[PDB]
Design an enzyme around this catalytic site. Structure first.
Site, mmCIF file in Angstrom:
data_model
loop_
_atom_site.group_PDB
_atom_site.id
_atom_site.type_symbol
_atom_site.label_atom_id
_atom_site.label_comp_id
_atom_site.label_asym_id
_atom_site.label_seq_id
_atom_site.Cartn_x
_atom_site.Cartn_y
_atom_site.Cartn_z
ATOM 1 N N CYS A 161 0.961 -1.362 0.155
ATOM 2 C CA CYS A 161 -0.316 -0.046 -0.254
ATOM 3 C C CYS A 161 0.945 1.474 -0.518
ATOM 4 O O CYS A 161 0.626 2.281 -0.794
ATOM 5 C CB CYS A 161 -1.348 -0.262 1.337
ATOM 6 S SG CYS A 161 -2.099 -0.950 1.460
ATOM 7 N N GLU A 162 2.193 0.946 0.891
ATOM 8 C CA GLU A 162 2.613 2.626 1.298
ATOM 9 C C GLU A 162 3.548 2.822 -0.398
ATOM 10 O O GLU A 162 3.781 4.179 -0.808
ATOM 11 C CB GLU A 162 3.393 2.504 2.430
ATOM 12 C CG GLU A 162 2.186 2.661 3.363
ATOM 13 C CD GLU A 162 1.756 3.565 3.686
ATOM 14 O OE1 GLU A 162 1.233 4.884 2.703
ATOM 15 O OE2 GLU A 162 0.835 3.681 4.869
ATOM 16 N N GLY A 163 3.681 1.115 -0.844
ATOM 17 C CA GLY A 163 4.758 1.725 -2.046
ATOM 18 C C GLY A 163 4.167 1.897 -2.719
ATOM 19 O O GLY A 163 5.105 2.808 -3.663
#
Length: 238
Positions: A161-163
């Site tokens: 998700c953050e990537g």
């Protein structure tokens, strides 16, 4: 509702960056271009999400499918090899996922997964990803045993998700994807990451007024819109 292509976790021939870039291409197809915003803006939020990202992560022995809601790039649940869907939340909440899902007994925020700890504490990488998938795949209990499953979920959350959301995270993770000591984010990166929606509101704001001064950004080490544009890859609609 797009099924991202499979990610062969254990296969060192398939880099993490190529997965990220691939999955971003899929997401961007449902994004719009706003005047004054570098990054592609995600579908607007809804109580009941209409656009979904189903990303399968498979090791050499098992696999799981992540159920990510595009409109805020946010892991909602995951499917096990046995076909069982587990969703963040608990009894009495409304299921966003179909096919007879089960609640994990806890939410999926950095609150619920690691408490007040910093994102720098979460270790990531190909090995971590492999261990997380295999473990989450052998899940049969109702968030109930206990949550080293929270620990496995937070790693996937940050790596996937953050990537997808930050160029900071995607480059950090990729650069250390096959290392022995794993890879983690800096304290500053972590503060920015936990601020995605805020950096995102800043993006809109900097579209309205390119010169505007935004202390919520200065305080995170983000000087202006040019600096924010290189950190966040995809912005949350505001």
């Amino acid at each position: 509702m797009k099924f991202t292509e499979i990610f062969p976790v254990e296969d060192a021939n398939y880099p993490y960056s190529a997965f990220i870039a691939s999955v971003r291409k899929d997401v961007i197809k449902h994004c719009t271009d706003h005047k004054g915003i570098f990054q592609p803006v995600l579908p607007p939020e809804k109580k009941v999400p209409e656009l979904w990202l189903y990303t399968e992560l498979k090791t050499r022995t098992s696999s799981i499918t992540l159920a990510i809601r595009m409109d805020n790039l946010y892991l909602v649940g995951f499917r096990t090899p046995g076909g069982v869907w587990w969703e963040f939340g608990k009894d009495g909440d409304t299921h966003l996922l179909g096919d007879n899902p089960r609640w994990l007994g806890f939410g999926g925020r950095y609150q619920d997964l690691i408490g007040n700890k910093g994102l720098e504490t979460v270790t990531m990488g190909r090995a971590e990803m492999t261990r997380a998938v295999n473990d989450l795949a052998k899940k049969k209990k109702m968030l109930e045993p206990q949550a080293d499953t929270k620990s496995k979920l937070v790693k996937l959350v940050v790596m996937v998700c953050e990537g997808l959301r930050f160029n900071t995270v995607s480059r950090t993770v990729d650069a250390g994807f096959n290392s022995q000591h794993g890879v983690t984010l800096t304290v500053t990166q972590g503060k920015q990451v936990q601020k995605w929606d805020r950096i995102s509101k800043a993006a809109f704001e900097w579209a309205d007024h390119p010169t505007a001064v935004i202390p919520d950004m200065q305080k995170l080490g983000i000087k202006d819109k040019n600096e924010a544009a290189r950190i966040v890859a995809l912005v949350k609609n505001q």
